Design an enzyme around this catalytic site. Structure first.
Site, short mmCIF file in Angstrom:
data_model
loop_
_atom_site.label_atom_id
_atom_site.label_comp_id
_atom_site.label_asym_id
_atom_site.label_seq_id
_atom_site.Cartn_x
_atom_site.Cartn_y
_atom_site.Cartn_z
N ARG A 1 43.00 42.26 84.43
CA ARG A 1 41.67 41.67 84.08
C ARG A 1 41.48 40.64 85.21
O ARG A 1 42.59 39.89 85.60
CB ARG A 1 41.89 40.75 82.65
CG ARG A 1 40.45 40.43 82.12
CD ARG A 1 40.67 39.61 80.87
NE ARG A 1 41.08 40.44 80.07
CZ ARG A 1 41.80 39.94 78.64
NH1 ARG A 1 41.74 38.71 78.45
NH2 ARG A 1 41.97 41.11 77.83
N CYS A 350 41.44 45.56 64.95
CA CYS A 350 42.33 44.79 64.23
C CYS A 350 42.00 43.38 64.04
O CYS A 350 40.86 42.97 64.79
CB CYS A 350 43.93 44.76 64.91
SG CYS A 350 43.89 43.58 66.28
C1 SRM Z 1 38.85 43.44 76.38
C2 SRM Z 1 38.58 42.53 74.97
C3 SRM Z 1 37.66 43.07 73.90
C4 SRM Z 1 36.56 43.81 74.52
O1 SRM Z 1 36.48 45.05 74.08
O2 SRM Z 1 35.68 43.57 75.26
C5 SRM Z 1 39.99 42.13 74.60
C6 SRM Z 1 41.18 43.20 74.46
C7 SRM Z 1 42.27 42.47 73.91
N1 SRM Z 1 42.58 41.39 73.47
FE1 SRM Z 1 41.06 39.81 72.91
N2 SRM Z 1 39.70 40.84 73.95
C8 SRM Z 1 38.52 40.59 74.30
C9 SRM Z 1 38.17 39.35 73.84
C10 SRM Z 1 38.49 38.67 72.60
C11 SRM Z 1 38.05 37.71 71.88
C12 SRM Z 1 36.25 37.59 71.90
C13 SRM Z 1 35.91 36.54 72.66
O3 SRM Z 1 36.67 35.61 73.54
O4 SRM Z 1 34.85 36.20 73.29
C14 SRM Z 1 38.61 37.12 70.87
C15 SRM Z 1 38.25 36.62 69.54
C16 SRM Z 1 38.13 35.28 69.54
C17 SRM Z 1 39.06 34.17 69.65
O5 SRM Z 1 39.83 34.32 70.63
O6 SRM Z 1 39.47 33.71 68.68
C18 SRM Z 1 39.88 37.97 71.24
C19 SRM Z 1 41.16 37.63 70.51
C20 SRM Z 1 42.39 38.22 70.73
C21 SRM Z 1 43.62 37.78 70.07
C22 SRM Z 1 43.75 36.83 68.87
C23 SRM Z 1 44.28 35.66 69.51
C24 SRM Z 1 44.48 34.46 68.74
O7 SRM Z 1 43.85 33.61 68.48
O8 SRM Z 1 45.30 34.87 67.38
C25 SRM Z 1 44.67 38.75 70.67
C26 SRM Z 1 46.13 38.96 70.28
C27 SRM Z 1 46.82 37.91 70.96
O9 SRM Z 1 46.65 36.98 71.91
O10 SRM Z 1 48.32 37.77 70.63
C28 SRM Z 1 43.96 39.35 71.79
C29 SRM Z 1 44.51 40.38 72.73
C30 SRM Z 1 43.99 41.37 73.14
C31 SRM Z 1 44.64 42.37 74.00
C32 SRM Z 1 45.09 41.97 75.43
C33 SRM Z 1 45.73 42.99 73.53
C34 SRM Z 1 47.10 42.41 73.65
O11 SRM Z 1 47.42 41.01 73.43
O12 SRM Z 1 48.04 42.99 74.21
C35 SRM Z 1 43.48 43.40 74.21
C36 SRM Z 1 43.57 44.27 75.32
C37 SRM Z 1 43.05 45.61 74.90
C38 SRM Z 1 42.87 46.55 75.82
O13 SRM Z 1 43.64 47.64 75.98
O14 SRM Z 1 41.91 46.36 76.98
N3 SRM Z 1 42.74 39.13 71.77
N4 SRM Z 1 39.88 38.65 72.06
C39 SRM Z 1 38.13 41.22 75.43
C40 SRM Z 1 38.42 40.73 76.87
C41 SRM Z 1 37.99 39.34 77.14
C42 SRM Z 1 38.39 38.77 78.61
O15 SRM Z 1 37.94 39.24 79.50
O16 SRM Z 1 39.04 37.88 78.65
S1 SF4 Z 2 42.38 46.31 68.60
FE1 SF4 Z 2 42.82 44.38 68.01
S2 SF4 Z 2 43.73 43.37 69.69
FE2 SF4 Z 2 43.01 45.36 70.41
S3 SF4 Z 2 41.35 45.18 71.31
FE3 SF4 Z 2 40.61 45.51 69.19
S4 SF4 Z 2 40.67 43.48 68.11
FE4 SF4 Z 2 41.63 42.99 70.20
O1 SO3 Z 3 41.37 39.24 75.85
S1 SO3 Z 3 41.77 38.57 74.57
O2 SO3 Z 3 43.19 38.62 74.53
O3 SO3 Z 3 41.36 37.19 74.71
#
Ligand code: SRM
Ligand code: SF4
Ligand code: SO3
Ligand code: NA
Length: 441
Positions: A1, A350
């Site tokens: 990223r 999830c």
């Molecule tokens: C790509 C994306 C979704 C999408 O289809 O667009 C994404 C993808 C993943 N997120 Fe996220 N998150 C993405 C936006 C979000 C958002 C929405 C937002 O920020 O606008 C959330 C919910 C808002 C929030 O933060 O509360 C979000 C909350 C999470 C969380 C929960 C963190 C928490 O507060 O508990 C995780 C899990 C973790 O960090 O342990 C997570 C974890 C992940 C991971 C990195 C899985 C991991 O920890 O190994 C994902 C990788 C999937 C993959 O194979 O690509 N991602 N994730 C977004 C990438 C954003 C970026 O460029 O930085």
């Molecule tokens: S499956 Fe869960 S952690 Fe993986 S990209 Fe979707 S919401 Fe984020």
């Molecule tokens: O991309 S998510 O992990 O914030």
């Protein structure tokens, strides 16, 4: 990223990432994320590549409204998003938002700077703190939370405030997310510490309202003789498909385009700053490549997270489920005579909540293969968390429920009334007024 404040990426940068995706990854795709950046999947050199075109890979990408109705506000808002991004260089999520657009989904974020103007010129920001959508299934100690108003600051305090919020959260964090800290110590307590650290006192909130969260698909007029073309890209997944060479089309556009691209918080792409005389050339490529294939308003307002196959945390399909799911939803909207309407509808694989289902009018939260919790009763503008309606159900059960409910909405709605608001008014679902206390039944 990649770090990419406000989603702004040059055409030279685009060509480089296009080459890298095609040659050096398993999946071959560029994936636009909903935080205004891009990802490669299955990297097979990489940072060297990003560095070669001036890109670098706690704090996350800083968002900025991509295509504001008042076009002249973009430049300075973007400048501030970039300054904040650079200031916070050594999880915490930050946005800069330009009313009336909430495309960046501010209530999903720890820290939000809401642009305020005096004379078509940016003068300051309202600060909203403490949004975050992650939950753990069945754990009523976790919750999605919207962000709380702290007050107004003039531009001169922006960086000091940004730093004060980030450090206060890091320091006071346990359950470590800002939303939990705020609830534990109290909004006023947190706010007072931010004021102390930043050396400021917040002024009263200045007026703002949001009217929507969608992108502006197609052409819009920008400042001067410039035009912006927003291309709907399903799941932000850029790859060449049969009859729809999306990746090749974007490369060809990057070769002739005079301005930059902007990756939106809805996983779409804007060809930004096109001179009027260049519109026809750009459009011809976009159209012929499948980038301008018409979809329903519903599909334009639906979103999923990556989930399978790459996400190690995935419980149910999201990105791969969405296109056929929305085919079925399109069928329901057509059935009920509301094909011109939309429901902000999101699927997250999830409960971590990346797909932002917990700000949707209709949200699906993955629980197991083929199974989702169905949440109802968010609103179009994204200021309310949707309560769980049905738990751990399959697509056929979801569609049967939505057929009934969309049918009722079509027949019973008031003028202009959103589906989410309708489910609340009609008593189908109870609204969430205070998530830390009333999200969970
Ligand atoms: C790509 C994306 C979704 C999408 O289809 O667009 C994404 C993808 C993943 N997120 Fe996220 N998150 C993405 C936006 C979000 C958002 C929405 C937002 O920020 O606008 C959330 C919910 C808002 C929030 O933060 O509360 C979000 C909350 C999470 C969380 C929960 C963190 C928490 O507060 O508990 C995780 C899990 C973790 O960090 O342990 C997570 C974890 C992940 C991971 C990195 C899985 C991991 O920890 O190994 C994902 C990788 C999937 C993959 O194979 O690509 N991602 N994730 C977004 C990438 C954003 C970026 O460029 O930085
Ligand atoms: S499956 Fe869960 S952690 Fe993986 S990209 Fe979707 S919401 Fe984020
Ligand atoms: O991309 S998510 O992990 O914030
Ligand atoms: Na999209």
């Amino acid at each position: 990223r990649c770090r990419l404040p406000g989603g702004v990426i040059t055409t030279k940068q685009w060509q480089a990432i296009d080459k890298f995706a095609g040659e050096n990854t398993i999946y071959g795709s560029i994936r636009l994320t909903n935080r205004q950046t891009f990802q490669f999947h299955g990297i097979l050199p990489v940072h060297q590549m990003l560095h070669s075109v001036g890109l670098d890979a706690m704090n996350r990408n800083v968002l900025c409204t991509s295509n504001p109705y008042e076009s002249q506000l973009h430049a300075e808002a973007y400048e501030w998003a970039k300054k904040i991004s650079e200031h916070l260089l050594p999880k915490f999520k930050t946005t800069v938002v330009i009313p009336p657009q909430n495309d960046i989904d501010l209530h999903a974020n720890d820290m939000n700077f809401v642009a305020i103007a005096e004379n078509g010129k940016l003068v300051g920001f309202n600060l909203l703190v403490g949004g975050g959508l992650s939950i753990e299934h069945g754990n009523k100690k976790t919750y999605a939370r919207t962000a709380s108003e702290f007050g107004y600051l003039p531009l001169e305090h922006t960086l000091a405030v940004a730093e004060a919020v980030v450090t206060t959260q890091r320091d006071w964090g346990n359950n470590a997310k800002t939303k939990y800290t705020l609830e534990r110590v109290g909004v006023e307590t947190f706010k007072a510490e931010v004021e102390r650290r930043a050396g400021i006192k917040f002024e009263p909130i200045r007026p703002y309202e949001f009217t929507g969260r969608g992108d502006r698909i197609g052409w819009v007029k920008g400042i001067d003789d410039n035009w912006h073309l927003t291309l709907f890209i399903e799941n932000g997944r850029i790859l060449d498909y049969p009859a729809r060479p999306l990746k090749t089309g974007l490369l060809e556009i990057a070769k002739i385009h005079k301005g930059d691209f902007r990756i939106t918080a809805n996983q779409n792409l804007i060809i930004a700053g096109v001179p009027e005389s260049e519109k026809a050339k750009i459009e011809k490529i976009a159209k012929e490549s499948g980038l301008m294939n018409a979809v329903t308003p519903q599909r334009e307002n639906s979103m999923a997270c990556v989930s399978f196959p790459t996400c190690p945390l995935a419980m149910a399909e999201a990105e791969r489920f969405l296109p056929s799911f929305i085919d079925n939803i399109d069928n329901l909207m057509a059935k009920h005579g509301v094909s011109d309407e939309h429901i902000v509808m999101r699927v997250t694989g999830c409960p971590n909540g990346c797909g932002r289902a917990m700000l949707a009018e209709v949200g699906l939260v993955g629980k197991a293969p083929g199974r989702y919790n169905l949440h109802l009763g968010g609103n179009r503008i994204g200021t309310r968390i949707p309560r769980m309606y049905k738990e751990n159900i399959t697509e056929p059960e979801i569609l049967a429920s939505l057929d009934e409910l969309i049918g009722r909405w079509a027949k019973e709605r008031e003028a202009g009334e959103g589906f989410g608001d309708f489910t609340v008014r009609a008593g189908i679902i109870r609204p969430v007024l205070d998530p830390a206390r009333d999200l969970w039944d």
